[PDB]
Amino acid sequence: KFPGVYKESFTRDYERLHNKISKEVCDQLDDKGYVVIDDCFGHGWASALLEEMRWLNENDHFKPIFEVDLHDAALRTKVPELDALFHSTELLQALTTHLPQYDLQFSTSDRTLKLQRNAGHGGCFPCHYDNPGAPNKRKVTCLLYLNEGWKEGDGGEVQLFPFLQQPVTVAPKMDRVVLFQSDWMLHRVLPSHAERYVLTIWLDGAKVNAPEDAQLRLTQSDLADWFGFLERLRRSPVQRLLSRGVYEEEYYESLMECMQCVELLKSHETHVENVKRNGPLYGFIQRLRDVRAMN
Ligand SMILES: [Fe+2]
Numbered sequence: 186k187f188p189g190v191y192k193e194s195f196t197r198d199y200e201r202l203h204n205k206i207s208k209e210v211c212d213q214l215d216d217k218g219y220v221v222i223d224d225c226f227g228h229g230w231a232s233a234l235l236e237e238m239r240w241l242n243e244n245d246h247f248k249p250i251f252e253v254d255l256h257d258a259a260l261r262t263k264v265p266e267l268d269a270l271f272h273s274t275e276l277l278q279a280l281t282t283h284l285p286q287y288d289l290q291f292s293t294s295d296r297t298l299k300l301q302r303n304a305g306h307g308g309c310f311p312c313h314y315d316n317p318g319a320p321n322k323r324k325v326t327c328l329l330y331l332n333e334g335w336k337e338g339d340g341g342e343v344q345l346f347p348f349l350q351q352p353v354t355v356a357p358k359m360d361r362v363v364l365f366q367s368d369w370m371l372h373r374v375l376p377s378h379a380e381r382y383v384l385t386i387w388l389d390g391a392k393v394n395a396p397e398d399a400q401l402r403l404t405q406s407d408l409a410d411w412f413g414f415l416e417r418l419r420r421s422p423v424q425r426l427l428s429r430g431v432y433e434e435e436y437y438e439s440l441m442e443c444m445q446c447v448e449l450l451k452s453h454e455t456h457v458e459n460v461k462r463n464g465p466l467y468g469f470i471q472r473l474r475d476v477r478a479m480n
Contacts, residue, residue, distance in 0.1 A: 222364070327386040327388065341378075348419040368394070431470055
């Protein structure tokens with residue numbers, strides 16, 4: 186059904202993809218919580234994927250900001266490059282080679298490939314983790330950005346909040362890939378003033394939302410080295426229990442854009458007050474906020 190003619194010549198270059206997801210890239214993902222890869226697929230190949238996405242959108246396959254999931258083989262058969270991307274295991278292979286501990290899954294049940302079009306109309310983008318807990322199975326988030334000649338002011342950046350560090354703002358440039366931790370990387374999307382396409386791949390982990398992820402250790406060594414304690418916190422999903430307190434201002438400002446919804450705000454308002462009534466938790470949150478202010 187996709188006509189099959191592309192505006193530019195390209196190579197479905199699996200080896201390039203595999204080589205882009207290097208040991209160094211994986212070490213950064215594991216250490217910093219995120220990593221950015223420019224010109225990952227190559228311009229022709231990225232253009233080809235975008236063309237197929239625009240086609241899907243012309244033929245009303247995007248459904249209410251609009252999204253489509255490519256789990257449906259019936260749909261995938263219409264878009265050969267997107268179908269090949271769905272079946273590609275290069276990402277899974279590199280990550281499981283360099284980061285075996287994440288226990289990522291090859292089954293098609295444990296990957297999600299989502300397409301998203303954002304009209305460019307402001308909207309609602311709360312601060313969140315891609316895996317907020319519970320039953321969510323996501324371990325690695327993989328974002329492919331597809332906006333050519335993106336310019337300052339176009340907006341649509343993803344803002345990352347490595348816990349208690351300086352925030353990182355990442356422009357959604359054409360053929361840029363962002364990988365980050367679904368269960369311990371706080372983020373939000375900034376408002377877009379232009380049309381914005383993004384392709385998202387989520388890789389599930391068998392060990393996500395484990396019991397040891399829902400606790401913090403205080404050790405004797407920490408007493409003489411708080412950095413080590415903060416560093417374990419930064420890389421631990423337990424931070425999700427503390428993020429709304431530590432980043433109240435950021436969460437609240439995002440909700441103001443949503444207002445510009447009443448239930449989401451009341452929910453925040455209630456959570457913030459519950460924290461403040463929990464004296465020990467609150468003192469702890471405030472010390473973390475102090476660490477943040479010093480960085
Ligand atoms: Fe997200």
